């Protein structure tokens, strides 16, 4: 009587949104960027290899200084490497050896990690006692934490496998603003440069944009045909790129509320695990699971180059804040710095 | 050597960290990692109670014959399995527990599919998974006595219509074991070790130790180029 009416109303709204998006597609990003000189071949070499892990590396995150990066591996260790000297600054033992995320705080005082234990553990790097202590174990998620990101030293956003994203108060240790709306498992979230909005790519083939103080989903982005595994904002903050299991990267723009262009190749039939943008936003480095990472031009579908040198699936890669290096962490226990 | 004193001390600290990491890796490499993947509640707790101890994921630590073990009751995840099942790639074996009493019961959530058929489907899904091609499976068929009394009082044709054997416990158990083992499409790179356990059984740990030693010996022989 009413459930069918509600479903019909939802379908009519969905068609209305689809009609509205089409009216805004006067041109395409590929058509506009036709008269632009291609970036050409990008020959990035493995400058410095970071060895010492003994298991599969599932996540890494650079620091603000663009010199220190953290690495999370299945062996229960969290090494803070010094990329300039290939030095292990810290080795953090973990109570849970199953980790899927690790985040470096902008100030460098704290690092986070999480995984199948369903707890985000915040570790205090610089203190007295000369050790790294578990500052806070954030609990409340009912699923594995796929990705966590620091807003500041006290607020952290976490995505988990309960189809829910959460915003935490580290000092209080209590979930502050739950983010509901996803249908499948949330696999990755990225924070905007202004730390105001964040987009989470879930296993429902959709990426949703959220507002921090409001908890509402401003707008949802669809177009993928498989599970979204990676996500990353444009440096501007008005667009983001998603990585899925269908060998496809899609650049969604927030203001037009639709997809700009698709980075797909017929040769590639694997999935995509990690996606990041360069400092200028022209190159989209996507970490595929066919032992390779592909450097995609953001404005043109052409592939600039391929980052080869990993003997297993590439699981995590991110560009430094100054854009001077790319560090790809793969399933084989090695991190490679590329420039 | 074109390095400052603090740089040299940082290199020394990195070397000490690497030494500690190597020690931890040597300690962990001598431990056996097992993944517990029982279907629902098909006697998944009786086995861990029998093995003793010496939140989404549960780790059970027990030592037998000076060998450390690592069981991971990951059934309390309630998420999409294939998004985290590759974390367990490289475990020595998978301990799959199936209750033989489920051949009469029907899943409450569905009320249509037999519980043992659901267990068979889960076994098929996990045995042929790409991440677990070379990982042996230790099959546990619990509820031996309750299945005994059922098969004495009730027939097995409810769960397996294409059954020709008698109602004796031995033939029924053999049929269930061969039906479960037939689901293994990797007859060459995998082995299934099957044991029938009850509530009072105490040789389950010894059976698991034998199976894990067999798996490790086969892996070592393959690694050393002898197979």
């Amino acid at each position: 009587s009413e459930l069918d009416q509600l479903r019909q109303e939802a379908e009519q709204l969905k068609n209305q949104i689809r009609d509205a998006r089409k009216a805004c597609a006067d041109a395409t990003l590929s058509q506009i960027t036709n008269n632009i000189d291609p970036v050409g071949r990008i020959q990035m070499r493995t400058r410095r290899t970071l060895r010492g892990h003994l298991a599969k590396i599932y996540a890494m995150h650079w620091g603000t200084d663009s010199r220190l990066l953290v690495s999370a591996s299945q062996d229960g260790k969290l090494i803070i490497w010094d990329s300039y000297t290939t030095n292990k600054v810290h080795a953090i033992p973990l109570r849970s050896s199953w980790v899927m995320t690790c985040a470096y705080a902008p100030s460098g005082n704290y690092v986070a990690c999480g995984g199948l234990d369903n707890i985000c553990s915040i570790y205090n790097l610089k203190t007295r006692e000369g050790n790294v202590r578990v500052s806070r174990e954030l609990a409340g998620h009912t699923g594995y934490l796929s990705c966590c990101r620091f807003l500041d030293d006290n607020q952290i956003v976490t995505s988990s496998g309960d189809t829910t994203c959460a915003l935490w108060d580290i000092e209080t240790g209590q979930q502050t603003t739950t983010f509901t709306g996803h249908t499948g498992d949330v696999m990755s979230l990225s924070l905007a440069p202004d730390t105001r909005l964040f987009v989470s790519g879930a296993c429902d083939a959709s990426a949703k944009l959220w507002d921090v103080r409001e908890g509402m989903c401003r707008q949802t982005f669809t177009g993928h045909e498989s599970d979204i595994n990676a996500i990353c904002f444009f440096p501007n903050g008005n667009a983001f790129a998603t990585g899925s299991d269908d060998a496809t990267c899609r650049l969604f723009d927030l203001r037009a509320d639709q997809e700009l262009m698709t980075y797909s190749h017929d040769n590639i039939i694997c999935g995509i695990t990690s996606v990041s943008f360069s400092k200028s936003g022209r190159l989209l480095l996507a970490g595929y699971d066919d032992f390779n990472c592909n450097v995609w031009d953001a404005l043109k579908a052409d592939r600039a180059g391929v980052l080869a040198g990993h003997d297993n699936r590439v699981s995590c890669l991110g560009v430094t804040d100054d854009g001077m290096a790319v560090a790809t962490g793969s399933w084989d226990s090695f991190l490679k710095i590329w420039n | 050597c074109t390095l400052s004193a603090e740089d040299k001390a940082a290199v020394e600290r990195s070397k000490m960290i690497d030494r500690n990491l190597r020690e931890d890796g040597e300690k962990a490499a001598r431990e056996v990692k097992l993944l517990l993947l029982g279907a629902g509640e098909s006697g998944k707790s009786t086995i861990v109670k029998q093995m003793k101890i010496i939140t989404g994921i549960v780790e059970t630590h027990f030592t037998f014959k000076d060998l450390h073990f690592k069981m991971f009751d990951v059934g309390g995840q309630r998420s999409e399995r294939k998004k985290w099942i590759h974390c367990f790639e490289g475990v020595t074996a998978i301990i799959f527990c199936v209750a033989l009493s489920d051949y009469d019961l029907v899943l409450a959530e569905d009320e249509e599919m037999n519980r043992m058929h659901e267990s068979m489907k889960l076994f098929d899904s996990i045995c042929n998974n790409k991440w677990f091609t070379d990982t042996s499976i230790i099959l546990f068929l619990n509820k031996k006595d309750l299945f005994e009394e059922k098969i004495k009082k009730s027939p097995l044709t409810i769960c397996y219509p294409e059954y020709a054997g008698s109602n004796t416990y031995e033939e029924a158990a053999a049929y269930i074991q061969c039906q479960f083992e037939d689901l293994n499409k990797r007859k060459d790179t995998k082995e299934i070790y099957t044991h029938f356990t009850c509530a009072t059984d105490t040789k389950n740990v010894q059976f698991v130790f034998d199976a894990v030693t067999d798996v490790i010996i086969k892996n070592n022989l393959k690694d050393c180029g002898l197979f």
Partner: single-chain antibody
Amino acid sequence: DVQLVESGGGLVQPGGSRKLSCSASGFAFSSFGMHWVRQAPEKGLEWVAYISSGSGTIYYADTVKGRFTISRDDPKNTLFLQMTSLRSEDTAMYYCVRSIYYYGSSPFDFWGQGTTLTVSSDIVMTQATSSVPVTPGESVSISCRSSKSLLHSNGNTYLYWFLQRPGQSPQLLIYRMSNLASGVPDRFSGSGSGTAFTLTISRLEAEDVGVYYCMQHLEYPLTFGAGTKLELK
């Protein structure tokens, strides 16, 4: 809290042998490299010895090389300095110094309390200002010079600023310059040009008086300049 209680000093006849023990509590002694710093009854600070984590690298001053030995016991959380054939030049206050070395670390961040002992090619660090009078609320500028440039090829210039209040152990103010120690206020600031270095305090209080020591960590042995005494008017 973090503390370093050191004892084992007293009246020693010349030519004797007495060892110093430094008990470490409230921090991970194993991961910290420990130093011994001397202080004559009326003279400046002088580096003595240093033992790293795991005793991998051990360094001595030229005046104590082959004569003193330094060792640590990590399980007992203690530091040792066995001194042999003590002379009249060793009568001083010996300080237990805590140091760590990673990227962004703060070496020499914590000091002991002193051990009263009495006996019956190197970079030269200079501070011209022996005494400086000042009133509270003003601004000072303590100047220290080096005989060799302390700006290494890696961009890190190795100079450390310490403050010794009357009757208290030295406290780290500013490690490799333009870096503020964890705990000291924002009044202190340091700058330099490879050879000439300065420390500036914006506003002075009654607790900022004392003697300021500049130290170099570019290469062993570590050298302390003669301190600049700050006295109220």
